Design a protein around this nucleic acid. Structure first.
Lengths: 125, 161, 227, 116
RNA sequence: UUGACCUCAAAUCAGGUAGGACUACGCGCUGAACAAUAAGCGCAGGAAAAGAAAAUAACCAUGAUUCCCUCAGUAACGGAGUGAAGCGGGAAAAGCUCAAAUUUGAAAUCUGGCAACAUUUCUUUUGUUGUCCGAGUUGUAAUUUCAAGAAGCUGCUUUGAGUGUAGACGAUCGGUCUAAGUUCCUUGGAACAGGACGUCAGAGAGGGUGAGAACCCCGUCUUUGGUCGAUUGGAUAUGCCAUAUAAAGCGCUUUCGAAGAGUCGAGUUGUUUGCAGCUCUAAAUGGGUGGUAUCAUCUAAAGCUAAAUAUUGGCGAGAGACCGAUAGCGAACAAGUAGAGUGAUCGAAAGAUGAAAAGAACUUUGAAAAGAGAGUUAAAUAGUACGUGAAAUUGCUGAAAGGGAAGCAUUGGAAAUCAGUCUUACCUGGGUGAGAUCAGUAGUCUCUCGAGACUAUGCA
RNA sequence: UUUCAAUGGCCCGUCUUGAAACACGGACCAAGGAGUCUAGCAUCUAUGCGAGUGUUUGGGUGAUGAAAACCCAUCCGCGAAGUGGGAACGCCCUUGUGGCGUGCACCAGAGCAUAGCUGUUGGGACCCGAAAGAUGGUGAGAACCAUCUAGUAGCUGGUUCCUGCCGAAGUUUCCGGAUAGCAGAAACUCAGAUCAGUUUUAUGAGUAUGUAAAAUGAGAGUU
RNA sequence: UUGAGAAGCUCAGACGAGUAGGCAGGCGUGGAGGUUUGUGACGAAGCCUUGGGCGUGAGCCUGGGUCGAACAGCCUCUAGUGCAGAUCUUGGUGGAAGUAGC
RNA sequence: GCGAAACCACAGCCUGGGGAACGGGCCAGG
RNA sequence: AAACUUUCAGCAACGGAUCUCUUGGCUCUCGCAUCGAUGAAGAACGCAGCGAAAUGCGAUACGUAAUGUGAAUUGAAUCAUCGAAUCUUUGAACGCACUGCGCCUUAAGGCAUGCCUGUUUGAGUGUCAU
């Protein structure tokens, strides 16, 4: 149970906060769990998704499909993956969006900021 | 509902949220350091005062007190003297020991005479003796400031120390 | 209440008949002696295993009612210690019942911060909180209360007598100071005596079928008679 | 016009926090001043003893506390009240003296110029 | 002629300030109908107002104001109705500043300019020191406010409007720190469902995610706290300065002790005792108000003042036995909007495809709108006229009945259609094997000798 | 279920008046739509305590949800200071007798608090239906707008599920009512007793009428 | 003889119109506390139906169809709780009528 | 070609009677 | 018969009830104190994305700087924080009319009214001194 009176358990206010969040908040809202190997190597359970991240789909119809994150569509809380698409009537392949919580990160797109973030969350690089 | 509140709802600008809502929270103690060290941040102010051996009120209490466990002639008032009172707890002993040790340290209440005060009283003593202060004050030439006998006596006393 | 500016009760976008007001009577007084009578009567009902079963508690494997545990329980720090104790005295069947009973509320209640409903588990009663409250509070259905401030909303949930209560040794020993007796005043309630009953032996079959009474009654007629 | 009391529990808590906020500011000293013991002014209640406003100047003089330092140590002064009987004088002088017997007054720093 | 002073001026002189808006809650001046109300007008703040007795009382007396409870629906007014207050119980408590007496051995006082020196929520803010001018003797400081007090005398107790440094304790603001399944089987478009085996819980609040997720995600608990930014509170400790030849409290008196006027009050008119106009107009142990029907109490015509209290507005926050799109704000969306009126003003209707647009490519008819073949979807009985899709009403098809009170009720026929009711078991005999709750049987476990559960071995 | 045959069968709601009739309302369907909340007073019932009773103005307290629950210091409100006869005993074959009589009627406190019900008085007060009037504005005497204001209809219209049980009066008397009376609830006592839209016996008075005490039926009287 | 929801079981007799009015027992709706170790994507709720059943009735249970995410029984609490009418309110749709007419 | 509105409890052949219109709605007939 | 009329059923229309939903309302409670001549509230006109009958912004026109977060929108940002800059014409609205018409000084600086303190320049048959 929550005890702080600074956090609201109102469904009206929690839904309003999630569906009216700015893009800075939406960055943390779309986080994905790291794979077991990365979990024990980076000492981090989950990370926000970023472009060029190598992920595996865990749930849904596209379960098992691997690929890089081609674009993080924050306005819809969706991830776009390479070659994970759907055929249209005219033959053009329409990309399929997968929720960030339904994928697992198997390889991180490490940069200077991500390494500092890793050691910030108690993580050995 | 109000047009001002509708205006800020329709805006794309975030609200000026402030998070100050935490009841059951009791004010932290500043002021006395001994009290702060021995204070219990959970217990109420009555429970803390009683534990520290202090009085939260020198008067009656206007309700029932909490019971947690089942407990098992004008001459002789204006002239009597009460020899303080025992310190029940250790916290009160620290307060009492600190008070007396500071009073002893800041106890120099004797003022030494200055250059002018020394010369002023010296001229009066070397002419009108030592034990007669009334004649010293009644002098007009040497006692130009017209100090009375009490002030000249104090100038003498401060000169000695 | 509705807004005062809101709004004929039949016309669309009109004013409701007899608009609701805030100064309705929301709180209702009860004599303090009546509250104490109900709380005493609800503690007594918690000592009857049959009333516990009829209130939905799965106490069929509990070793004894009333169930009193040691005071080392008062200093449990981890929920693992709390669950292990509940499994040793076989009181975890009630917790399993509460966990399996979690459903979505039926109706508009779940639109109003009442999403889920479930059952009531054991009520742990303690003397002093040195860890017991935080070790048991995350267990579903378990409520923890101090023996000095017993709540009739917890001792008779729903108005139904016979809640399953686990006491610590210190809480049980202090029950005689909280309530007292019929002849000795309560120590923690000034001028309070336990209520007396208008019947001495409530087993009325014992009185009716006693040698004192059955030796003077006339010879009983038949049961359902022949036509 | 109806005055509701839905804020009755809220006012109880708000006043409790004011008591704790006051005690946080003044750590070791009581949150109330010592009040005298007086008699209500009517034949219906004159046998009761209740709390007064402050101690009279004749009460303070007898107990040894000057009116200029009485307020500094938490002793209220009532210039209006007077002692018409020797009983009221003795009842409240003893109240002051018992108060002074239980009082720890912490010393203050004083400026002592180097010269005379 | 010049100068001092006064008066009237002027200046795009320098430096300031006022207006307007919002008014839920303040306080005023008003003011109808029916209430000391609405409306009108004026003025504020985070509270306002009130406030340290020209107050009560008749007691063993109380002791500024405000608010709550009670007094009390009482006294009183006038039967109805209007309707207090003293006491009492609580919340909070804090007291003071002037006018009126010569600093007269010394205008001791203050604004401004200029020049330096600091200081900052701050290059934006605040001062300090020096000098000159001005204000001011038609009175600026110190001193005094009746609770007293002044002046002397007296021997006891006292003392910073200073500026640094360090640490601690607080408050505020912004970063940072965070436990555990997405394992197996089944259904499904999707697992967040069901079943199995687990895990974490100071975290089983809530929300998100393709269906009911503590363990997928954000969070939640720890946190009534660790760790860093920066701001500032009151203190503590310790330096450096301290204009003390000074300033206070308490003793004493062969010495003094000022106290608010077109105001109180009296008469007469209104409003409501108050207030106001008008005519007149005071006093010094006087004056006010009470109990006497002399006593008691107070000390007006000058001023300030936190807290307890109020709060439909504003800046935020948490809730709910509330409403659930004809409801709840007029407004869940475009909402004081579209629209209506010369204008004052008035003022709506209107929410939902799907998990994903995958929003129907392509072929074909038509001038087009569209249609038809197809195609997507788990579903198009979800195609944007989009969740579900009631009734009234309409069209087509099928069947039946027809000539006017009609529908309807009762009883059956015909036609159409529907419902459930089944023989199957029981008893008995033998044969064949089987096994235990049977052993002229051996062990274990849990309860209270024997009671359940099993494990071997034999099948009389 | 549709239809047929035989038999029967008017359109509801309101108002009216003797019931009517008549006049009102009703094109159809969906949704909405009318005795509510609160403050007093009285009654009854339940519950707690009981010469007492009432925690919630307030204080304490509540470590996890803290508007709850729990505890109560000083006040205060209200309150207070001869017979008959139920039941029981002992005798009498039983009736009946004898001793002992509560409550009440004839000749040693009972209250306070809460809840529910019912009635009633106020608040918009079951809903709806006529214009007031006043205040403040707009436009050009009059008009128009917005608030007081839920200012109103002695009345008009409407007022939402079922079954069961009881069941009137529809009028004497004074005079909008006090009544009475009719119909129920409660508190009783009472067959070793009474009651009656009834008939009698005979004589009293004038076949009728009345009388006290027989027949028939019913247990009755009450407050 | 088991027939003690003593609030149960059982035996007997009589009676049955009903306005105003009075008094009991029930049915249904929104929300709340408790409970059914309750129902639900292997299909909740709603809706449709000449399917079946239960109750004197208010009503309730169920088959099939449709549908797509929640919902109910019991004990208690609560109330903005039940419609055919109000020349009722809002919305939808009829006959008049393809008429009067342009 | 375009296109209303009022109105609408519901049906609708007459002679007699149904007492309160009875009538259109009942009864007896054509 | 057929038509029409009527009834029933199926399908198709019409309609938008019911159910379920809900970034909304309503109600209660809690903390806080902050508009303006340094130009407010309000109005108008522009800007760029747009669907505006919405939002943001002001010619530096979805804002620029700074502190961040760290890779999008659909040193990035239609992001957060926020102490620096900018903020059109109006409006208490202020040079006069209400965009014209002006004045003075150096396109810029300015140029409202009342009042308070001071400064400076004057006048007076004001009173006095020489």
């Amino acid at each position: 149970m929550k005890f702080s009176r600074d956090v609201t358990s109102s469904r009206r206010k929690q839904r309003k906060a999630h569906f009216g969040a700015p893009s800075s908040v939406r960055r943390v809202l779309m986080s994905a769990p790291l794979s077991k190997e990365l979990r024990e190597q980076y000492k981090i359970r989950s990370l926000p998704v970023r472009r060029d991240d190598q992920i595996t789909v865990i749930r849904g119809s596209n379960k098992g499909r691997e690929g890089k994150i081609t674009s993080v569509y924050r306005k819809k809380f969706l991830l776009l993956i390479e070659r994970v698409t759907r055929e249209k009537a005219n033959g053009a392949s329409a990309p399929v969006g997968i929720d960030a919580s339904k994928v697992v990160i198997t390889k991180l797109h490490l940069d200077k900021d991500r390494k500092d973030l890793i050691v910030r969350k108690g993580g050995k690089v | 509902a109000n047009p001002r509140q509708r205006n800020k709802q329709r805006s794309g600008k975030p609200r000026l949220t402030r998070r100050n809502a935490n009841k059951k929270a009791k004010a932290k103690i500043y002021g006395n350091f001994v009290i702060q060290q021995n204070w219990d941040k959970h217990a109420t102010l009555r429970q803390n005062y009683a534990r520290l051996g202090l009085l939260a009120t020198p008067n009656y209490v206007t309700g029932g007190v909490e019971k947690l466990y089942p407990d098992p002639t004008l001459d002789d008032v204006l002239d009597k003297e009460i020899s303080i009172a025992p310190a029940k707890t250790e916290v009160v002993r620290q307060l009492e020991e600190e008070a007396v040790k500071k009073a002893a340290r800041q106890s120099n209440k004797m003022l030494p005479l200055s250059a002018f005060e020394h010369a002023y009283i010296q001229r009066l003593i070397n002419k009108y003796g030592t034990e007669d202060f009334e004649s010293m004050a009644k002098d007009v030439k040497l006692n130009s400031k017209l100090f009375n006998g009490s002030k000249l006596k104090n100038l003498y006393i401060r000169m000695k120390a | 209440a509705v807004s005062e500016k809101a709004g004929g009760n039949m016309c669309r976008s009109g004013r409701m008949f007899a608009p609701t007001k805030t100064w309705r009577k929301w709180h209702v007084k009860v004599n303090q002696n009546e509250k104490r009578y109900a709380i005493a009567s609800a503690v007594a009902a918690s000592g009857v295993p049959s009333l516990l079963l009829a209130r939905g508690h799965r106490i069929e494997e509990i070793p004894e009612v009333p169930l009193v545990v040691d005071d080392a329980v008062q200093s449990f720090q981890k929920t693992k210690e709390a669950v292990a104790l509940l499994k040793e005295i076989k009181a975890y069947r009630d917790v399993i019942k509460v966990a399996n009973s979690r459903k979505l509320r039926a109706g508009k209640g779940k639109l109003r911060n009442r999403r889920h409903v479930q059952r009531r588990g054991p009520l742990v009663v303690f003397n002093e909180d040195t860890g017991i409250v935080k070790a048991f509070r995350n267990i579903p259905g378990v409520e923890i209360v101090n023996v000095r401030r017993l709540n009739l909303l917890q001792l008779a949930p729903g108005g139904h007598l016979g809640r399953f209560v686990i006491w610590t040794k210190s809480a049980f020993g202090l029950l005689d100071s909280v309530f007292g007796s019929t002849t000795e005043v309560a120590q923690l309630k000034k001028n309070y005596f336990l209520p007396e009953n208008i019947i001495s032996n409530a087993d009325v079959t014992r009185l009716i079928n006693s040698d004192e009474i059955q030796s003077i009654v006339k010879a009983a007629g038949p049961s359902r008679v022949k036509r | 016009y109806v005055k509701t009391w839905f804020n009755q529990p809220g006012r109880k808590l708000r006043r409790r926090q004011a008591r704790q906020t006051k005690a946080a500011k003044i750590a070791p000293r009581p949150v109330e001043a010592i009040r005298p013991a007086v008699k209500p002014p009517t034949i219906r209640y004159n046998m009761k003893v209740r709390a007064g406003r402050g101690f009279t100047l004749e009460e303070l003089k007898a107990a040894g506390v000057s009116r200029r330092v009485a307020s500094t140590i938490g002793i209220p002064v009532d210039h209006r009240r007077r002692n018409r009987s020797e009983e009221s004088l003795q009842r409240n002088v003893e109240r002051i003296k018992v108060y002074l017997a239980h009082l720890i007054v912490f010393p203050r720093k004083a400026g002592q110029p180097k010269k005379g």
